[PDB]
């Protein structure tokens, strides 16, 4: 018997921000019945030369349960066929950031690879000058346009060192190797509430996340934003 939800994970998150290369690796844990995950990361390329906050929320929906059972992400892991993830973020100042994810599974252990490319950050904005201080909690909205796709959308805000909000919008595409169960396509959309904590230096990140999915939710349209 090999049927397993995740208990542990590791992330290799790498790429560039405004052409500057970064690379971080580390181990983490979570509880796939509660939606909790935490992750340690260490840089393999010296001091991050940009706000470490730009890697949140990108630093494993395999830990997210749904209101009534496994999420489609968990079902894809357990079945073994899995899924791929593409995220785009559009920032208020015209900057753009993409992340592509691939996973492999060794029983209850996940190996994540996340490739990041951020461009168009103003040279003196809060990202390149390292003056982001916090994130807002966040609702995501998950839709299923077909049986192999989930589209997720969210508004995102960082706090800056002057106490302003620095805003973006995010679109995430999930591609499933096997069709999702009919029940998922019927009980949509799904809203997920997420809270995060980040402790960081120049070279190290300690990330935590709490998340909970909500189904059958009326007039959530202008409130999740």
Numbering used by the authors: 9 to 67, 71 to 236
Task: Provide text from the study.
mNeonGreen, an engineered green fluorescent protein (GFP) derived from lancelet, is one of the most brightly fluorescent homologs of Aequorea victoria jellyfish GFP (avGFP) yet reported. However, we were ultimately successful in creating a variant, designated as NeonCyan1, with a tryptophan-derived cyan fluorescent protein (CFP)-type chromophore, and two additional mutants with distinct spectral hues. NeonCyan1 has the ‘double humped’ excitation and emission spectra that are characteristic of FPs with Trp-derived chromophores in the neutral state, such as mTurquoise2 and mCerulean3. To obtain insight into the molecular basis of the empirically determined biophysical and photophysical properties of NeonCyan1 and its variants, we determined the crystal structure of NeonCyan0.95 at close to physiological pH (pH 7.5), NeonCyan0.95 at acidic pH (pH 5.6), and NeonCyan1-T207D at close to physiological pH (pH 6.5).
In addition to obtaining the structure of NeonCyan0.95 at physiological pH, we also obtained the structure of NeonCyan0.95 at an acidic pH (estimated to be ~5.6) which is below the apparent pKa of NeonCyan1 (6.4). The most notable differences between two structures are the different configurations of the chromophore, which is in a Z,Z configuration at physiological pH and Z,E configuration at acidic pH, the presence of a sulfate ion bound in close proximity to the chromophore at acidic pH, and a partial deformation of β-strands 10 and 11. Absorbance spectra of the NeonCyan1 variants in the presence and absence of sulfate ion, at pH 4 and 7.4, did not reveal any substantial effect on the absorption profile. Relative to the Z,Z chromophore stereoisomer in NeonCyan0.95 at pH 7.5, the chromophore of NeonCyan0.95 at pH 5.6 was revealed to be flipped to the Z,E stereoisomer. At acidic pH, the distance to the nitrogen atom of the imidazolinone ring has increased to 3.34 +/− 0.16 Å, which indicates a weaker hydrogen bond and may even be consistent with Glu222 being deprotonated. Associated with this weaker interaction is an outward movement of β-strand 11, which contains Glu220, and β-strand 10. This conformational change may help to sterically accommodate the Z,E stereoisomer of the chromophore. Similarly, the crystal structure of NeonCyan0.95 at pH 5.6 revealed that the chromophore is in the Z,E configuration. This observation supports the conclusion that the NeonCyan1 structure can accommodate the Z,E stereoisomer.
